[PDB]
Design a protein around this ligand. Structure first.
Ligand SMILES: [Mg+2]
Ligand SMILES: [Mg+2]
Lengths: 250, 250, 250, 250
């Protein structure tokens, strides 16, 4: 068990990428709380992985600052001290910077940026100085690395997460908090969200997009998260982890 | 005159970096509108560079979305079609991610991020398809590249500006808008803000910080902006320009 | 066993980083050939990890092009088809670009650059199209990311390894070779070489160097290589993996 | 005259990119020595820009270490102390890492890497501590940033130049040598070399390659070199300058 004794919060954990991360975390012996906006989906999501001795659903909107403090108390009350925060909750808008409304601009940043900030900030306050091998894993993207002309606000959010985590990682390092902070940069990953977008996977699978000629699967992101959640990565902080089938290598 | 016929809006243009950018722009034959929050500082700032045939002050808070539209109308009414937007307005908070209040978080992002978004978006809408050699120059930072443990929210903002601008450049490139978008990444620059911070220049001048052993001067940032504003840089877009005395090279 | 059925060649595998990589690889069920220049060191290195059913020493200088072919034949004869090449062999010279003799320049590049090229090229030729989950792992450095004023030729080499590997990954991806190529970028790692350098660990442990306040240990590099060698990382190619205690994050 | 009093050596200066750099340098008032392997081409190249009071051809192979010392003596004897070295000489091979012969591997690195090293090293020794506003400009590439599956050895060379220059820049900075070192990263630039390759510009102009939909012209690289050669860039060292029509921004 590579995550023995670990206690993790995975936001957006009821579907797609966060679901697999949750799945593999429990598999490696961690206790897990997954968050989502819908109780029915969330409960069934948690149950699909295991019983309440290893995983629980908690309804939480990642942009809900007050809820974050509650989320931590509930998790600790369930499983004990939190060791791992995976800020995975995120939304995407398909708009150019030119075509981005302010309502869209602020809605997306509310989840993608403020949510990652709330979880990082709270995670540091709660996990520092307890010798937990604590780990904050902030879900950025390939869109944190390069631009996409139709993902303006998303790019801003993922680029914001990338460098902020470095800020967080340095602080924790310098203050011996025993908290690492890192970013994971998924390329295109096959999720039900992508399967809803007609022709999207086909677009993403083009060699000019993803060199390997296919997009990834949620477990590809899950395994890199396990590495970063485990003490195997005790010397890695402030770094970006790219799993994109070669998207950003060209 | 390398900026002949250019018409520029320089936000935060009444002091430090934006002041010199304005100064050199007029020197190269551009017409310039500078923005600031204080009229007494702003008017005198404009007068120190030239008369109203080449430069004007406009009171505007860069986080003021509605004001951005007024700013464009006033500039075009004064000088004709805008060819150059310099998103330079920005504030800094000296707090770790851990110690960052949400008010500080939102105040800083409102100027540093929303303001760059407002000016980029409006700038694209207003400058596209007019064959102006149009140029959007977004002021990021060395803090868009690496972390600083006491600049959490600032890192987030400058990282957001870095990758969003890339989004913007691609769209403009792909759509033949004749608008380039680029980022400038100043290192430590001697400004009245820095001279107000006791011992700050001395900290920034340490070789572990700035290899050259001194910090820069506003004209150092001014000249790279001129390059980016002129048609000498017609093939440069979506790229980052670093002037930091070697800060990020180590 | 995360490396079940894997067959690996670890160059420079008799000491420090390559030693632990070899150690953990066998631990995860891989068969391993380690290379070195000295038989007494090498044989004992192999014996310390296991018997000849799981690990063997082979005397080979990584700059030895002809030897590379012998190395592959011996490994396959011993263990079957090679699935994993770890280009880890490398030397360092403590000279500025200014003070670098051409002999030092060429000696270092012969091991650090030519050796990684020889092993990548041969590895691709030998491992492609066999459905092995084949993985080339090229040992770069933090010195592939940023400069060091007293490591001129080393920077050149590690920067060469970083971008060449990307070339390699794309080709393998685009041609469906089933070979991934990635780079690992160790920061300062406690090795017998470092313990031989008086005061070196102390210099590397300074917060201006390594934020965490200590340097790493060979197992820190070992575990990221395992990740990259296993099918957990099947969607990762052309990417850089940084384990440096935060060195490059500031 | 932005290059008043400057004395520059431009290798590969008889054609394409180096030719324009030479052209614009003289235009900005610098004295220039251009190098090439053919006397007839070189002489006519120099004459096309001006008389021997402002530019001279010198036959030199950039991989010729001994010749470098001669090149410096001849230039200084002609125009006085050298202030600017532009390492622009370079060759490309269209081979994958897999398909790269060692003869090709070593030939390309001999010009692209050893040549840049010889010029950087010699430039530092000769230009330091003379208050010349000295500038070393090393021609890397977009291929110093991302991989290309058919430019294996080229990628290695341009990635090597990128990080080595940082090494050089840090050293000069830390030692107050008054020498900056920087890299320029051309994307696709229309040269007679490209015009010789059938369908190449058409390939390079595809939106999936260069967002702007066309490739650049030698003067695009020329102007960024002028900036870096002038004292306008006195605070820029160890940085990469990307002029690629958006190639690397996606
Ligand atoms: Mg750094
Ligand atoms: Mg790319």
């Amino acid at each position: 068990d590579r995550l023995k004794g670990k206690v993790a919060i995975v936001t957006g954990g009821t579907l797609g990428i966060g679901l697999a991360i949750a799945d593999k975390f429990v598999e490696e012996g961690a206790k897990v709380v997954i968050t989502g906006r819908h109780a029915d989906v969330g409960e069934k999501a948690a149950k699909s992985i295991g019983g309440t001795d290893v995983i629980r659903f908690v309804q939480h909107d990642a942009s809900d600052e007050a809820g974050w403090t509650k989320l931590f108390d509930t998790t600790e009350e369930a499983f004990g001290p939190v060791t791992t925060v995976v800020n995975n909750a995120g939304i995407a808008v398909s708009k150019s910077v030119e075509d981005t409304t302010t309502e869209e601009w602020r809605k997306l940043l509310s989840v993608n940026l403020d949510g990652v900030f709330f979880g990082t900030r709270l995670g540091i306050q709660r996990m520092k100085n307890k010798g937990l091998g604590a780990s904050i894993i902030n879900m950025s993207s390939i869109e944190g690395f390069v631009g996409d002309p139709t993902l303006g606000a998303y790019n801003a959010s993922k680029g914001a997460v990338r460098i902020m985590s470095k800020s967080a990682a340095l602080d924790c390092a310098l203050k011996d908090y025993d908290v690492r902070v890192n970013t994971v940069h998924p390329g295109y990953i096959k999720t039900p969200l992508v399967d809803d977008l007609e022709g999207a996977e086909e677009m993403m699978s083009q060699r000019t997009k993803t060199p390997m000629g296919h997009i990834g699967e949620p477990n590809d992101i899950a395994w890199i998260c396990v590495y970063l959640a485990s003490d195997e990565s005790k010397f890695a902080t402030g770094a970006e982890f790219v799993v994109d089938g070669g998207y950003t290598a060209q």
